[PDB]
């Protein structure tokens, strides 16, 4: 690949700044672009910079170009949860019809909620009784907690998901677990996970 990006992936807390790198060997050089790609979506163009411009700004995104050393930086100011995406560096060699685009492999940025008051707990969600499933909710833990998969093929566990109650200015993690078997109870649902010692089991 003519276009290389750094880091491969990174995790930051919301409210913080971060810088992503891009280095290329593309000759000749016409322009450099930064793309934001959300999960299951097409890339969106953020900044296009020709060799003539050393800076470009798109809201909270600021791109830098040093065409001598063939390097670009993308700075995100005051990162937000919505910034969680793949960031692609793309380079063009010509601006004419005969030109071509070279795609870097991307940087995966995860922005975590800043959870000040973790209240970890595992709840049982009263069955619709229209369904035969039993559902357990592991919630309100901080993002340091990892949710492991079950050791049972009849038990399904989904990874931590960040929910955002914009009103109360409240964000929370949660993981869902469900099974059809009579064996299944919320006390043992997340037994394969390392959970906070003070997790509330009603």
């Amino acid at each position: 690949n003519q276009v290389e990006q750094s880091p491969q992936s990174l995790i930051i807390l919301e409210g913080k700044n971060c810088t992503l790198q891009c280095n290329y060997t593309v000759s000749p050089f016409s322009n450099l672009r930064w793309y934001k790609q959300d999960t299951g979506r097409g890339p969106v163009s953020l900044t296009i910079m020709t060799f003539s411009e050393n800076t470009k700004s798109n809201g909270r995104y600021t791109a830098t170009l040093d065409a001598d050393t063939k390097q670009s930086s993308l700075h995100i100011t005051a990162s937000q949860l919505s910034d969680s995406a793949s960031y692609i560096c793309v380079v063009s060699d010509r601006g004419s019809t005969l030109g071509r685009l070279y795609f870097g492999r991307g940087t995966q940025l995860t922005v975590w909620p800043d959870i000040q008051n973790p209240d970890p707990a595992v709840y049982q969600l009263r069955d619709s009784k229209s369904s035969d499933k039993s559902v357990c909710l592991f919630t309100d833990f901080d993002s340091q907690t990892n949710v492991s998969q079950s050791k049972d093929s009849d038990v399904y566990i989904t990874d931590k998901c960040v929910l955002d109650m914009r009103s109360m200015d409240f964000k929370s993690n949660s993981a869902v677990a469900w099974s059809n078997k009579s064996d299944f109870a919320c006390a043992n649902a997340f037994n394969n996970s390392i959970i906070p010692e003070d997790t509330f089991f009603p």
């Binding site: 097409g42 969600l125 009103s167």
Partner: protein
């Protein structure tokens, strides 16, 4: 702008697929990219203009046509399970900084047999009373289960409008049987509201799942309901308690 149809496709092995891409922006340069979930974008075809067709960086059994400036259709002569992914069309402007514009993409799944196709079953799970007592908040869970293919869009509806705040749906569906190629899928979602909002009986909560499946054109010889494109839904009302 730039357009792609169909948004979703499920087709049997060995059948011909045409993916439409059009734009009326007057752009000459057009691209076709392929991408599996979680992978990097792979250029598969590009075009300089009205009568140009060049191969991309990755080999494919697909061909492209550029008989007109407006249209850049992709053709899969006989579909195979390995063609399954998202196909994205793009065009760049002839002016300014030559911005690239991506179409909404087509999500294609090639199944061995169309009888592998199932709509979701959808169930809503009411908030725990222990959570309400402990947090003054109420989380509803929605489960969409046993669907194939993974062509699904989940949304929460409170009192007839779609809600986005207080919602988290899994980025990717689970496989029911991660050992099979045509395994069925499960999706989880959460909606959290205040305890007082949940406790109001006039408040109505609905989990909707838009499933993309067979069309009226597709043939169905099985006894079960034809697994067509449809919305499967589940609902709950505020509990007095």
């Amino acid at each position: 702008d730039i357009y792609q149809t169909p948004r979703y496709l499920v087709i049997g092995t060995g059948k011909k697929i045409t993916l439409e891409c059009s734009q009326t922006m007057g752009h000459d340069k057009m691209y076709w990219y392929q991408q599996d979930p979680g992978m990097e974008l792979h250029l598969i075809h590009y075009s300089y203009g009205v009568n140009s067709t060049e191969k991309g960086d990755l080999s494919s059994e697909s061909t492209v046509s550029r008989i007109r400036t407006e249209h850049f259709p992709l053709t899969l002569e006989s579909a195979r399970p390995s063609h399954t992914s998202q196909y994205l069309c793009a065009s760049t402007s002839r002016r300014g900084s030559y911005e690239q514009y991506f179409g909404p993409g087509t999500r294609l799944t090639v199944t061995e047999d169309l009888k592998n196709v199932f709509p979701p079953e959808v169930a809503v799970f009411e908030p725990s009373e222990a959570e309400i007592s402990h947090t003054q908040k109420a989380t509803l869970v929605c489960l969409a289960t046993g669907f194939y293919p993974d062509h699904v869009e989940l949304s929460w509806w409170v009192n007839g409008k779609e809600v986005h705040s207080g919602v988290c749906t899994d980025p990717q569906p689970l496989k029911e049987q991660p050992a099979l190629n045509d395994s069925r899928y499960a999706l989880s979602s959460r909606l959290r509201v205040s305890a007082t909002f949940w406790q109001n009986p006039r408040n109505h909560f609905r989990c909707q799942v838009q499933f993309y499946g067979l069309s009226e054109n597709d043939e169905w010889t099985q006894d079960r309901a034809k697994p067509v494109t449809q919305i499967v839904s589940a609902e709950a009302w505020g509990r007095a308690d």
